[PDB]
Structure 1
Amino acid sequence: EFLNSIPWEEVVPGQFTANPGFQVTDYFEIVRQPADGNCFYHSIAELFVPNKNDFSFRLVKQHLELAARRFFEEESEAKGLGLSLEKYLEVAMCDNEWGGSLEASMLAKHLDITIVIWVIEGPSRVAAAVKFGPGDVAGAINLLHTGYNHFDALRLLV
C-alpha cells in the first residue's frame, strides 16, 4: 500500500516525522469532532472506544494519568518546561484542556499502540506527519490536525 510505503525519519526514540504531499480525503474519512477543548481526546475515543459518545473522551484522559507518572519525567518533549508532574496533571487533567504531541507520545507508549498525527496546511493538503509508535499506519489511530488548534478522526478506507 501507499501508506505502508512511507519514508519515516527518526527524531527521537518513539517519534518519526515525514512530509508527504497529498490530499487527505483521497484515502481517509474525516470524522469531525466538537471544539470544546477536548477534541484530541474525542478523536482518540472515536477510534479507540466501542460506541463512542461525546463524553467517552474522559475515559481516555484516565489512561493519561497513568502514562504521566510513567514517562513525563522521561519524555523528550517535557524537558525544558519548568513544570513538575503535579503542576502538569493539575491543568492537563482539568476539563476542557488542549492536548498535543506530548499526550500522543505518552499514550502510544502506554497503550502499546501507534498514534499518527496528520497536520494539514491550507484547506486540505497535508503539510507534515508525526508518528509516535512503531506500528502500521493502516492499523494506527490516525488523527487530523486541521488548522493549528483542532483534532478530528481519520477512518481508514477499504
Structure 2
Amino acid sequence: PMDFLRSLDWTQVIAGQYVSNPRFNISDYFEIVRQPGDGNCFYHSIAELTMPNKTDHSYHYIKRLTESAARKYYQEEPEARLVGLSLEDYLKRMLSDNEWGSTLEASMLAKEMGITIIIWTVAASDEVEAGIKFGDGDVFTAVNLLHSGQTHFDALRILPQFETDTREALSLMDRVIAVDQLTS
C-alpha cells in the first residue's frame, strides 16, 4: 500500500527524466480532479495542484512560468530538437489559447518551478500503462497528472490515507515571475 508507492522502480532514460511501468489502478491511490477538456488542461492540472485557490483562469500563471522556463531552458532541451521551432516561434504557439502542453513543457516547468512532475498514462481502464517523471523527487512530493485519451490531462491527489508530505506550491516570487513575462 504505502509499501507499494514506496517501491516504484524508476529508470532514468534521459537526464532528469525517468519512466516506470508499475501496474496499479489510479483510483486505488489517487483522487482524480477532473479538468475541462479545453486544450489548456495540462496547465489547469498543474494549477489545480500548485495553487490552493485555483480557478478556471489560474492556468495563465502556469503558462507564463512555462514562458519563463523556456527563455532559460528551451535551447538546451533534447525534445526542443524535435519541436524544431525557434524559441520565439515556440512561445507564440505555446502561449496561444487551447494549445496543449506536453512532455517538453513538463520538463522545463519542473526546472523552473523546482518541482517533480509525474505523468501517469492510462488507456481505456484506469490501470496505469506507464509513468513518466520529470525531476528527482518521489511520488509523495510530486505534482501527479493523469493523461488519458490522446490529449487530456487531469490532476491527481494522493488519497489521504497515503498522503505524507507538505505539498508543492506556487510561491509569491513565482507569481511575480509570471507577471513579469506578461508585461514583456
Scaled by the length of structure 2, the TM-score of the pair is: 0.83
Q: Partner residue of 2:181?
A: none
Partner of 2:28: helix, strand, or coil? coil
Whichever residue aligns with residue 140 of structure 2, its letter is A
Gaps in structure 2 of 5+ consecutive residues = 161-184
Q: CA deviation at 1:126?
A: 0.7
Q: CA deviation at 1:3?
A: 1.6
Scaled by the length of structure 1, the TM-score of the pair is: 0.97
Q: Partner residue of 1:78?
A: 80
Pairing 1:33–2:56 present: no
Task: Tell me how far apart the structure 2 counterparts of residues 42 and 63 of structure 1 sit (CA, whole Å).
Answer: 13
Q: Partner residue of 1:144?
A: 146
Output aligned runs, 1:1-158, within 5 Å. Answer: 1=2, 2-158=4-160
Task: Tell me how far apart the structure 1 counterparts of residues 150 and 21 of structure 2 sit (CA, whole Å).
Answer: 17
Deviates more, 1:75-84 or 1:58-67: 75-84
Partner of 1:25: helix, strand, or coil? helix
Identical columns (%): 58
Report the structure number with the largest CA radius of gyration: 2
User: How many positions carry a matched residue from both structures?
Assistant: 158
Task: Tell me how far apart the structure 1 counterparts of residues 133 and 153 of structure 2 sit (CA, whole Å).
Answer: 15
Q: Considering fraction of residues, name the structure with more helix.
A: 2
Provide Cα deviations, 1:78-130, integer angstroms capped at 9, x if missing partner: 11333110110011011111011100010001111000000012221110010
Gaps in structure 1 of 5+ consecutive residues = none
> Moved runs in structure 1, 4+ residues, more than 6 A?
none
